Amino acid sequence: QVQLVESGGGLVQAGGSLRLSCAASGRTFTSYAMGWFRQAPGKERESVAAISSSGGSTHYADSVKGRFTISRDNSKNTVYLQMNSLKPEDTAVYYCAAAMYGSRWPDWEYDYWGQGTQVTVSS
Amino acid sequence: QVQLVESGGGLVQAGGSLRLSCAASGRTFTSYAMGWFRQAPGKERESVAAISSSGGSTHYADSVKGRFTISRDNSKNTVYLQMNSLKPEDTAVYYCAAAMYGSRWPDWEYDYWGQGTQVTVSS
Amino acid sequence: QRSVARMDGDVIIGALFSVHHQPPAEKVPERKCGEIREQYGIQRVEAMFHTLDKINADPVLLPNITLGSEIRDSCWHSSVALEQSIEFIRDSLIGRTKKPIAGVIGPGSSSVAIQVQNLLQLFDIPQIAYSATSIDLSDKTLYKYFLRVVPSDTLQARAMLDIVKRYNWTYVSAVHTEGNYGESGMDAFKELAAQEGLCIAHSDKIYSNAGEKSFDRLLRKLRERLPKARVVVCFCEGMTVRGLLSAMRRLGVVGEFSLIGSDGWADRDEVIEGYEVEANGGITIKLQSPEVRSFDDYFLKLRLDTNHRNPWFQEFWQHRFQCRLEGFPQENSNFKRICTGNESLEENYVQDSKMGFVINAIYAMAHGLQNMHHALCPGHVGLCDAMKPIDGSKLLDFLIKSSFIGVSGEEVWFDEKGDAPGRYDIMNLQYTEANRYDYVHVGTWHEGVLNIDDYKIQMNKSGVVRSVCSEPCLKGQIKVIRKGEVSCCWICTACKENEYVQDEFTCKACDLGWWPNADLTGCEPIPVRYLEWSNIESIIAIAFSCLGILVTLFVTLIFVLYRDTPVVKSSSRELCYIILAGIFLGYVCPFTLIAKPTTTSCYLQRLLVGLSSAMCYSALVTKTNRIARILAGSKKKICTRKPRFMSAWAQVIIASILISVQLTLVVTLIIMEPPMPILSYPSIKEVYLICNTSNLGVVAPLGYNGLLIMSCTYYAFKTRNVPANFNEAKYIAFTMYTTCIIWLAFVPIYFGSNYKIITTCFAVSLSVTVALGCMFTPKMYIII
Amino acid sequence: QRSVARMDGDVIIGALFSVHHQPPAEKVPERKCGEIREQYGIQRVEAMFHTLDKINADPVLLPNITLGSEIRDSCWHSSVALEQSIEFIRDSLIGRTKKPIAGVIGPGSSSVAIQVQNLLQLFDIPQIAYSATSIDLSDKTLYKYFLRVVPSDTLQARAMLDIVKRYNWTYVSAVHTEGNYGESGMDAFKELAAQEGLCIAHSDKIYSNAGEKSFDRLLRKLRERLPKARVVVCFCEGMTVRGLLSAMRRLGVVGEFSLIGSDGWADRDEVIEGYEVEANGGITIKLQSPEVRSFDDYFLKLRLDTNHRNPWFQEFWQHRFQCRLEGFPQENSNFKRICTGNESLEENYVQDSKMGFVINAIYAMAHGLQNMHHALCPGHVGLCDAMKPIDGSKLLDFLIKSSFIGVSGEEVWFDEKGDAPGRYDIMNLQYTEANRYDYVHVGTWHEGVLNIDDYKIQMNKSGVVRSVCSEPCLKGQIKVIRKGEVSCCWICTACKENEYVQDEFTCKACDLGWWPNADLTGCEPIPVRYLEWSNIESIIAIAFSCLGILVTLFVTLIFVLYRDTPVVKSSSRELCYIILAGIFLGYVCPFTLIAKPTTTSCYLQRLLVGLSSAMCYSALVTKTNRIARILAGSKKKICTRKPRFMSAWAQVIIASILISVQLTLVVTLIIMEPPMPILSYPSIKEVYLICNTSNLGVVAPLGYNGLLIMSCTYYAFKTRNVPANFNEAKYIAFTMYTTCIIWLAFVPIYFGSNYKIITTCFAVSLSVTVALGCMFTPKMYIII
Ligand SMILES: N[C@@H](Cn1oc(=O)[nH]c1=O)C(=O)O
């Protein structure tokens, strides 16, 4: 079964482009699809970032579409993101969750979760 | 590396025929010979008895000769020293020892030494 | 690392299905698999999930025991099948152990079943293979843990023997694709065919990859054989019966021999795709699989949205309907459209023939775990401590001793060889419409049982096809005489007359004395030809013999009754009496030259052979010596040596002894060899009375006759010129001529001819009757 | 449970040596391996320990890298070895406990190497198979990780082919081992033997560990056709050939057929050990590998007290010397006669063939590791972060690249397909002393090169037979019957000698007038039988007729010159002139009667046999009708209608026309009949070519001459007894007797003569020479 780990979160500015490296265990990992849920303190969980299994097409929350990029390596058993044009509120607990099955995005039945990081963000 | 444990210590008077069962723990055990050692209170770890690897050739020290009975079961990974006619000098700490690449008995290589016991012969 | 569709239950039955295609040569050592197979792969992963849903709702089979699974993907390849097999035992071998896999629903190649069977036999994991149909997988020394709900190709071997035998075909040439399938199957068939009383002409080992010239040349050796043989048993595959058919086109030999192949081309319509009209009258066979219907409904209700227990459903969709589900995960960004809400599997659906077998196998396991539970956890319901962990060797025990009833109401069933019964469908390709061709039944096979429902088979075309290497001439007079080649390829031959089939193969010539009964079934006594009257054309010899006796009885009446006749008694009376004796001894025996040869009658018969002739000439020599002794003795033959006596009884005692000399010579040449016949039959046909005659005993008496006549006619050269009487002695030299000519002209028609008996009768009867007619019949009128 | 011989290092190289024999046939599902191999696995565990001692101790190979090993038992069984492969991978498959196997020194059977390959390549663990020959392991798509240090079987198939073709051997039995070695190697051999003129007696396949009854069965199937096909080309392993030799003892096959082996029986004094005489003169083929001598040192210097690292050592020892150990551990109860410590290993001690290779293979792993150490982390020492842990794919890249000279001095480098070069050293098993046995280098194969010196081979040059189903029995005037099924193994036969063989399978009857010449390579003219010259046996009649022609000139002298004779001064002169014409015709008959066998001279022969016979009777019919035209109005005949006239020239007219009717009719039928010299066959041997005829076609010539013979003799009725002219009653009578009787004599002899014109000249000569010397001597002698 899958065991996750989330890195790349940290103290960056309003306009600071930062990495999000969600490394994983399990060898099936290129079967799964990743997403990053966004739940900062005081605002509940909303799915903002996502990516299919193959890489293929991918998904960003329209609210931040063009303010990020997503990448993945089936090779290294690890997915990646990047924030662009960061804001004080673009922070959230970045629960890199992972769904094999699902519906239309963003309602995938995210099976295997990571710790995710409340990315400390300032200006 | 086959690890050993003993089973069946007991404080029993003379004449009480008593059982000791050293169980092994691992594959590759029908390829080991076994031994039974003892050390009296302030003594030396005498070679009580032993058996061949395949089973069907057994050795007993002069000091207990022919009285005690050593058998082995390979499916169980276990040896059984059943002693008769126990006498108060048949008291000692009894250790089992897996011997392999030995010379003539009792000049073997007892490398896989057991845990140890105390099997006293009271009054 | 691959995907693994799993149900968390209690006892877990692993599975290896052929989800994808085998890696193409690009990436075989990389071992990544191609596209989904949709009819072998995910159809079956859903059949298995379905059947575990059933068995976990069924109250009989495993109450209070959940029945999980771990499905993997074999890819129809050995290396990937084995990577997966290793993954099943990985967890079992040692965030801890989850569950040891109880069994493995065995991957659908024979030759990845074998290669996985090795790895599972190590661990005590019984493997049930729904389509591992090779011969080698019954040998449970190697593949001990190998169940299956399909028959070995030994049962196709049996079935194709049943068809070729059930039409009394016996001379069927054999072809096969090469490999574990085609060689093993065909070899088992071949030996079975041998012992059963079948035959072959060639055993072609054609490849699935061979050149057009290769099928051409194998078909060419078949074709040289084709004047004899008309049936070609095949363990050929799809592309191989295809390539053989491709050679048949190139020759223009579309419908000639009844090819009769195994299931390599039963429902393979591809073997005849754009080609059908050239495979008319080929009697193929397959496995009798029913379809399975509650599975159809489960499949065609599969909501792509509602499933959460099966990866490769998404890819099943996206490969069947070519649409990338943009919102759904694992989208195939390499397919060009978007998925509408309204597609469903109802279109182009074909439930596979190996599906009844997959669900039979998943049962045979669930009933193995059940039967094990009923017999090794008694009084307790579901998992007891015994069977926790569930042992594999004892499970194999119950699992092989567990009879059952399947999905299709048929019974799954295991021998000691861990193999199945073998239920088959026996099919034909024929005129079904206006020139149209579709694979259709005639009937079935069953365990040992046949069902040829003959009427539907090929409309008398396969009802008239026939071949044997020699058309049975099992009637007498007609041996089977072969080369030392093979038991079917003999040759028929007709027997010689003397022979008859006692030994069917070899007409027994029985002994002479028994001639072969009609139809050559034995032999009985031969008819004989003794010759008493001997014919009406021989009643002619009898007519002249009889008539001559009538006139000579009349001569004994009125001749001797007279007593006094001057010409008769001119000379010595004794000489006259000797002549009378001479003539009627010459004509006593030719009245009975008719006679029967018997050991007792042999003195009677073999006497009358030469002694009829002897006395016949004793007549002629009595008259010859009367005239020559009266020539010598009187002044007619003048000579210094005229040996007369004083009392003419001495001149007639010489005559008595000059007849007793020939008497002695002939009885001597008889008693040199006592009387018998020697029944020389010049053939098994011709049977006649043929007594011994040393040709010596013909030429000697003959020569004695001729020499005594010529010495006396030499003295009587002077009466062939002048008689001194009523013309007696002149007519008697005329007698000498007219009788010696018929004797010495008779010799080549007795010698150089074939028939002898009546011819000697002619010679001697004629000689005496005409001697009488020319010396004795005139005198009776001249002295009245 | 099984022993592992583990030595420590910081890189560990597993190995699969066949320590024990294969499990017994029934016991393989239990996988207990019988008896220690003493030459084949235990020397190889000592090889590997010795070599890793050496390489741990070498200052340049892997310096400050230390090597371990984990030898495990292969057992020569797929199931037994694949267990142990799982034990290799198991360490890392499922704080710290164990250490990962980097390399594997692959097992010796091709089959166990395949099975272990199919498991190891899944884990990235390279395999080097010190002697696994089968070509199937030459496709690096399936068997990626597979390196050899040996030649693939295609070379060995090629070598043994070069042997069997060189000795002229064609038709050879072929038993082989079941499994991949025997299969792939034997199939390669057999495929070549097809193309290179050979045949097959029986392609048999028997397993190694097979029970006796199967080997007995193979000796039945291999000793049938021994009367002809005496060279069984066994492709087998050691133990399969051993089971053959066991069945050769058990039944008395001992000297029957040869045994041309393969690398499985390379140079093995354990497969002939106790079967020496049973298979002497066997032509085996090992790989060129010098025996390693530092190993013979280290091995024959092994006391039973210094091996504290070879677990099978004690059981090896107890087995080697058939002696139990009184108080050593793992003593075997079955063994008896307790060992004395003074035991050497020099006792009938063959080291091994593959010992050069086993050492090379361990070096290949040593090099691949050291190439990796100075290609990934160069400038560092011992272990570095890269290769820790090793990547078996990277290491494999180094192995396939990296060349080196191993211990034995030989060079070894890997191809694109992990193979390696090798020569083959042929051997021949021989009586080498007063009853003592060796394999000796009797030649070498190397890359088409094949050097073998037959006088030194088996010590016999006639030696083994010219092995073929049918001889070079195709001597001139013989064909091939093709047998039916094998063309190479045909059936020899001399064709019908009347048929002349042109093509090698088509003997053909030559056309007429041409009789088959020498060697049946054509047909030559049945010559002309020229009857145009003479012949001494006929020259008697030729010169007699020439004297007939002489006295024809004499009658012309006495008659044609001086007419002044009362016979021609009285008679019609021209009757005597035309009997002179007809007699000169009956005498020039012999000149024109010999004729050449061409149609011109064929009609000539007709012009003599029917026509000159018609003219012979021209003379004779003129005689009769002449005297009879004067007999018409004479008393000598009685008639009122006279066939006469009053002109003498009109008498010659009537005789002339009653000749010329016959003449014209004969000229009519012979201008009608096409006569010809004919190449008829009264017999195959005659040089005939001589003229044909239907005899009834010349019976009409005889028929008219002969009805007129009846007329001539009919007039000789009274003219024989009307003596008027000078006794010409006598002579005319007797000579019309001569001509009638000699015609009526020759005519059954004419049809008795197969060729008739001999009889014609003979009879016509007599008849007309009587006409001269009998009707002309008296008349012209009294009027001389
Ligand atoms: N050529 C054989 C190898 N060989 O077989 C034996 O029986 N010994 C031995 O070294 C094979 O490829 O399996």
Author numbering:
A (entry chain D), B (entry chain C): 3 to 125
C (entry chain B), D (entry chain A): 35 to 128, 150 to 839
What are the paper's exact sentences on this?
Constitutive homo- or hetero-dimerization is the defining feature of class C GPCRs, and mGluRs form homodimers mediated by the intermolecular disulfide bond within the N-terminal extracellular domain (ECD). The large ECD of mGluRs can be divided into two parts: the venus flytrap (VFT) domain and the cysteine-rich domain (CRD). Here, we present two full-length mGlu1 structures in the apo and intermediate active states at 3.96 Å and 3.65 Å, respectively, using cryo-EM single particle analysis.
Eventually, we solved the cryo-EM structure of Nb43-bound mGlu1 at global resolution of 3.65 Å. However, the other VFT is in open state (mGlu1-A), even though Nb43 binds to both monomers of the dimeric mGlu1. Therefore, this Nb43-bound full-length dimeric mGlu1 is in the “Aco” conformation. L-Quisqualic acid interacts with both lobe 1 and lobe 2, and thus induces the closure of the VFT domain. Different from glutamate, L-Quisqualic acid contains a heterocyclic ring that forms a π - π interaction with Trp110. Nb43 serves as a PAM, which assists L-Quisqualic acid binding but is not potent enough to fully activate the receptor. Based on these results, we conclude that our mGlu1 structure is in an intermediate state during mGlu1 activation.
